[PDB]
Amino acid sequence: TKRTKKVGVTGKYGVRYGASLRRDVRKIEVQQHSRYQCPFCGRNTVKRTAAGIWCCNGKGCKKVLAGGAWTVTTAAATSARSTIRRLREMVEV
Amino acid sequence: GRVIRAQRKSGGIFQAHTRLRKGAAQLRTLDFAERHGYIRGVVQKIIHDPGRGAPLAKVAFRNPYHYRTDVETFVATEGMYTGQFVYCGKNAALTVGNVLPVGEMPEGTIISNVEEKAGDRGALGRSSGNYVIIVGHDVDTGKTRVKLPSGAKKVVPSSARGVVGIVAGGGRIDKPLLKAGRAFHKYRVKRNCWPRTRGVAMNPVDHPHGGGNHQHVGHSTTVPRQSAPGQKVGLIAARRTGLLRGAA
Amino acid sequence: NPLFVSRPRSFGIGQDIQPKRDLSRFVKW
Amino acid sequence: DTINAKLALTMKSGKYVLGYKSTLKTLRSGKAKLILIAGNCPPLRKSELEYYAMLSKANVHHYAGTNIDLGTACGKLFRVGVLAITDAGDSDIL
Amino acid sequence: VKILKPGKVALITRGRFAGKKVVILQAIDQGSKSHPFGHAVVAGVERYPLKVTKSMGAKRIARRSRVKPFIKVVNYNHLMPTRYALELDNLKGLITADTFKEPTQRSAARKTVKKTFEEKYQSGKSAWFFTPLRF
Amino acid sequence: AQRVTYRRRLAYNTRSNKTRIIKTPGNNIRYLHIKKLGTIPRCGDTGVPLQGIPALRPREFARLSHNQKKVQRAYGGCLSANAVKDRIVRAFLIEEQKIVKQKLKQ
Amino acid sequence: PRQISDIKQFLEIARRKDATSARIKKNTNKDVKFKLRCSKYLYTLVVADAKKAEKLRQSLPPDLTVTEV
RNA sequence: AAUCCGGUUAAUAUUCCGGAACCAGAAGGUGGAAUCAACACGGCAACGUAAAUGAAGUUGGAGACGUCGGCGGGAGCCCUGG
Ligand SMILES: [Zn+2]
């Protein structure tokens, strides 16, 4: 059963706080409570702890990543990484 | 009248709650290694600092002069992972998480935890998701122009250090708090500034906005810059007011 | 004789711990 | 020619070794010619495998793509970290 | 063509002598009724000789430059092969797989390996084998 | 049934006031104050508990023999076997990389 | 309290200087308990055979003080 | 860092009595081990033992940690057949 037409994870909030605010929170929490792939282990086991820290379990690669508030990587950081990569190559060459 | 809440915020009750904080996030002392070459440290912990929206990085460095390991409290940049190597110094590579002098970086680079002065150990662009842009350089009386998160332009000596990348923590203000409890929990580990009572809901003895048969200020909320404490409430030295639709 | 092997130290930046040299110029008198 | 097609036809007619423990066993036994290391490999493991291949005079190829991509190229539904081609069959992998 | 052959120097990664440098006496890939798998018989140094300087006396140098060896059967998965190798001038066939059942035989083999290792360390043509691994 | 009382003047359910019910050889049900559970030492590199070491309070380790507080291996009782093996391999490989770097420089 | 199961070990610990007194306890299940009061521990030996108990008593050091409870 | 049971007074009990233990500190009688030369062995490993030399310096761990929900085990209590 679908159990929810559109609210989804925000069904715990009942009818309060407003529809637009609930929708924005729904998108954020969907991003927040998502398993991501470790860029060093290749396993979909990365989970968030305390708004900016992402860890994946297992026997190996117990690394702790510094990421975004609810996503492992943000668009601005990716753009900055590309810009810094470009600048470093120009300086080296 | 009576002393207002703004004047009462001089300390005591309104001090910062720093029991659970893990330490100041200063970069490092500007030493010979960072001034003439580089030094390699290994990040070993990435921890959450209560009252701060950005993760902190505990990084271990080898003491050049003594048989000892020194642990720092870097402001973690996005993409930083435990066990990686960071390099601090003039000859450090232009890589995310490395600490380099501002004058040795190419124009237009994105940095964080920038120093206003040499040895300041980080002043600018320290909040989560914020960064500083190196606008330009000037060798004659070496000074670097940078762009601050507020949009202002600041001239700094071309020897101050900075961390390549953007502060971790992403865009934290994009999610609604949605609850007074969430706001209460956010500010509990920060200070006693929440909740806030409006001045117009007060009495004349309490606030300049208090009193009246209707909740109204009565006078203009734009007060002069050189106002005495106790009357410097509302919009202090407001250049403009109201809704603006399109400007630089 | 063969067991007496030289073990020099580079003493460069970030290579080895600096030797105990004279620091009288930087002493907080 | 590309290498994915060459890997596929070695899969059809050739001898392959999957994983890390079996790759180490093959390198130790010396019946190894080419080892393929995924881009997502641990750096310490990659250095160890390179040292093993240098000792055994075996060629190393650290091709692009993650271990998921290496497994997909190998035609398996699981992640493959280290590939060990012992017999090329009728190919020019080596 | 074999990465592990007699006379090769390897590093032990598991067990009591972890991080110790050993020399393979025989790389027995097959097995007899007992130990029917790919194990290796190795001789290593348990306590590396201490450093000696020109300012020490002859007696102190002799006391410090001593090696106590160990003979152990170690499987392949717990070894890290190197390429430094060893001459194995004397330890060729004197020590066999049968030298592990008698404690007296083990002691005699250990004494012989000790004599060979000390003689090799004196006028050391392989200093890497006798220097400790720092980890 | 029989009801019990605290045997000490601490009247609150604190972490230092842990109690266990015992039946004495007098058909008496009464409390017995006990200490907190011990902790196994953790690895310094991965944080995993160390195998072969009992769980005791910090002061209780002083009464144990030496071999009960460690493992007969390098870094025994401070690091796990996997951590020690990784350090050995990493050390050897990097020293080899230094040697080949010097040789290629020369 | 500590329990011993070796007759010769109990005899040695009885001949030890710190051994002062011994107690004989007979149970309804035809078992005899020999309890030695040392400085630190009370050592108990359980014997199921009366024939062995008699020889144990004879071989016990006569200079030791032994009482039956 | 370390205590329990039973009993005892008109009134004290983890304090008294009887029995049986534990911790810390101080000094230091054995004893096996190993040495005609150096400071033990066993297990392919996780690791184990009756001991199994260890000064500084450094490092790591324990102390040392939120809240809620379900699951499994144990002790005491409850219930039940002789
Ligand atoms: Zn991972």
| DSSP code per residue over E79-115 | EEE-S-----SSTTSSS-GGGGS-HHHHHHHHHHHHH
Q: Sign (positive/negative) of CA torsion B92, B98, B104, B109?
A: positive
Instruction: Answer for the pair A23, A9: CB distance below 8 angstroms, yes or no.
Output: no
Establish whether the CB of F11 is closer than 7 Å to any nucleic acid atom in strand H. no
Q: Residue B173 corresponds to which tokens in the numbers above?
A: 């203000």
Contact criterion met (CB < 8 Å) for B95 and A88 = yes
Question: Helix F81-105 to helix D43-56 angle, to the nearest 10 degrees?
Answer: 60
Q: Sign (positive/negative) of CA torsion F11, F13, F17, F23?
A: positive
Nucleotides of H under 7 A from a protein CB: 1-7, 14, 19-24, 37-54, 57-65, 75-78
With residue B163 as reference, give the H or E element that holds it.
strand B161-164
Establish whether the CB of E84 is closer than 7 Å to any nucleic acid atom in strand H. no
Burial B49-65 (b: 16+ CB within 10 A, else e): beebbbbbbbbebbebe
F with E: 3 or more CB pairs under 8 Å? yes
Establish whether the CB of F14 is closer than 7 Å to any nucleic acid atom in strand H. no
Quick check: C2 contacting E, CB < 8 Å? yes
As a whole number of angstroms, the distance between CA E118 and CA B132 comes to 63
Interacting residues of E49 by C-beta distance below 8 A, sequence separation 6+: E64, E65, E66, E67, E121, E130
Helix (H, G, I), strand (E, B) or coil at A27: helix
Q: Assign 3-class secondary structure to chain F.
A: CCCCCCCCCCCCCCCCCCEEEEEECCCEEEEEECCCCCECCECCCCCCECCCCCCECHHHHHHCCHHHHCCCCCCCCCCCHHHHHHHHHHHHHHHHHHHHHHHHHC
Contact criterion met (CB < 8 Å) for F90 and D51 = no
Cβ contacts (< 8 Å) between A91 and chain B: which residues? Answer: 94, 106
Sheet containing strand G42-47, edge to edge, reads G2-4, G42-47, G32-37, G21-26, G65-68
Quick check: A75 contacting B, CB < 8 Å? no
Identify residues of D whose CB sits under 8 angstroms from chain A CBs.
40, 42, 66-68, 79
Establish whether the CB of F62 is closer than 7 Å to any nucleic acid atom in strand H. yes
Burial F39-73 (b: 16+ CB within 10 A, else e): eebebebeeeebeebeebeeeeeeeeeeeebebeb
**Given phi > 0 = left and psi -120 to 50 = alpha, else beta, which region is E12?**
beta
As a whole number of angstroms, the distance between CA D71 and CA F80 comes to 31
The closest nt to E62, taking CA to C1', is H37
Establish whether the CB of F103 is closer than 7 Å to any nucleic acid atom in strand H. no
Amino acid at E110: R
Instruction: Answer for the pair B97, B84: CB distance below 8 angstroms, yes or no.
Output: yes
Whether the ω angle into residue B195 lies within 30 degrees of 0, i.e. cis, is: yes
Contact criterion met (CB < 8 Å) for D25 and E76 = yes
Question: Helix D67-74 to helix D4-12 angle, to the nearest 10 degrees?
Answer: 50
Q: With CA atoms as reference, report the closest residue to E18 among E95, E74, E96, E84.
A: E74
As a whole number of angstroms, the distance between CA F73 and CA F84 comes to 9
Q: With CA atoms as reference, report the closest residue to D15 among D29, B210, A69.
A: D29
- Which technique was the structure solved with, according to the deposited record? cryo-EM
Contact criterion met (CB < 8 Å) for D24 and E77 = yes
Interacting residues of G25 by C-beta distance below 8 A, sequence separation 6+: G32, G33, G35, G69
Helix (H, G, I), strand (E, B) or coil at B245: coil
Q: With CA atoms as reference, report the closest residue to E79 among D28, D26, D41.
A: D28
Going from the Cα of A57 to the center of ligand 1, the distance in angstroms, rounded, reads: 7
Establish whether the CB of F83 is closer than 7 Å to any nucleic acid atom in strand H. no
**Given phi > 0 = left and psi -120 to 50 = alpha, else beta, which region is B169?**
left
CA atom of F35 to C1′ atom of H17, Å = 29
DSSP calls for B105-162: SPTT-EEESB-SSTT----BS-STT--EEEEEEETTTTEEEEE-TTS-EEEEETT-EE
Q: With CA atoms as reference, report the closest residue to D86 among D2, D8, D10.
A: D10
CA distances from G11 to D3, G7, G15, G20 (A): 83, 6, 6, 13
Contact criterion met (CB < 8 Å) for F88 and E134 = no
Helix (H, G, I), strand (E, B) or coil at C2: coil
> What phi and psi values does residue E98 have, to the nearest 5 degrees?
-75, -10
CA atom of F60 to C1′ atom of H1, Å = 8
Interacting residues of F60 by C-beta distance below 8 A, sequence separation 6+: F38
Quick check: C29 contacting E, CB < 8 Å? no
As a whole number of angstroms, the distance between CA A63 and CA D42 comes to 12
Q: With CA atoms as reference, report the closest residue to E27 among E74, E70, E69.
A: E74
Chain A: partners with 3+ C-beta pairs within 8 Å:
B, D
Q: Give bridge partners of residue B81 from the DSSP assignment.
A: A65
The closest nt to E35, taking CA to C1', is H44
**Given phi > 0 = left and psi -120 to 50 = alpha, else beta, which region is A41?**
alpha
Quick check: D90 contacting F, CB < 8 Å? no
Helix (H, G, I), strand (E, B) or coil at D51: helix
Which among E3, E29, E77 is the nearest to D56, CB-wise?
A: E3
Helix (H, G, I), strand (E, B) or coil at C22: coil
Instruction: Answer for the pair A26, A7: CB distance below 8 angstroms, yes or no.
Output: yes
Quick check: A61 contacting D, CB < 8 Å? yes
Question: Helix D43-56 to helix D21-29 angle, to the nearest 10 degrees?
Answer: 20
Q: With CA atoms as reference, report the closest residue to A27 among A76, A65, A70.
A: A70
As a whole number of angstroms, the distance between CA D56 and CA D29 comes to 9
Q: Residue D60 corresponds to which tokens in the numbers above?
A: 């190393």
As a whole number of angstroms, the distance between CA D75 and CA D71 comes to 6
Going from the Cα of D49 to the center of ligand 1, the distance in angstroms, rounded, reads: 20
Taking residue B137's Cβ as centre, other Cβ atoms within 10 Å add up to: 16
As a whole number of angstroms, the distance between CA F37 and CA A23 comes to 47
Taking residue E93's Cβ as centre, other Cβ atoms within 10 Å add up to: 9
> What phi and psi values does residue G63 have, to the nearest 5 degrees?
-70, -15
CA distances from B3 to B12, B196, B229, G69 (A): 15, 16, 9, 88
CA within 13 Å, CB half, A71: 14
Chain F residue with minimal CA distance to D51? F93
CA distances from A52 to A70, B53, B57, B189, G33 (A): 7, 8, 12, 17, 69
As a whole number of angstroms, the distance between CA B102 and CA B3 comes to 46
Find tokens 């729904």 and name the residue.
A26
Burial of G31 by CB count in 10 Å (0-12 exposed, 13-18 middle, 19+ buried)?
middle
Find tokens 């003039």 and name the residue.
B90
Instruction: Answer for the pair B232, B6: CB distance below 8 angstroms, yes or no.
Output: yes
Instruction: Answer for the pair A45, A35: CB distance below 8 angstroms, yes or no.
Output: yes
Interacting residues of B152 by C-beta distance below 8 A, sequence separation 6+: none
Q: Residue B217 corresponds to which tokens in the numbers above?
A: 């200020």
Cα distance from D66 to chain F (closest Cα, Å)? 23
A with C: 3 or more CB pairs under 8 Å? no
Find tokens 């393929």 and name the residue.
D36
As a whole number of angstroms, the distance between CA F10 and CA E122 comes to 70
Q: How many CB pairs under 8 A join A and D?
A: 12
Taking residue B82's Cβ as centre, other Cβ atoms within 10 Å add up to: 20
Contact criterion met (CB < 8 Å) for E1 and D21 = no
Instruction: Answer for the pair D35, D49: CB distance below 8 angstroms, yes or no.
Output: yes
Chain G: partners with 3+ C-beta pairs within 8 Å:
none
Which among E54, E121, E122 is the nearest to C4, CB-wise?
A: E54
Q: What is the resolution of this structure in A?
A: 2.4
Cα distance from C8 to chain E (closest Cα, Å)? 14
CA atom of B201 to C1′ atom of H63, Å = 51
Establish whether the CB of G62 is closer than 7 Å to any nucleic acid atom in strand H. no
Q: Give bridge partners of residue F78 from the DSSP assignment.
A: none
Q: With CA atoms as reference, report the closest residue to E52 among E66, E41, E42, E40.
A: E66
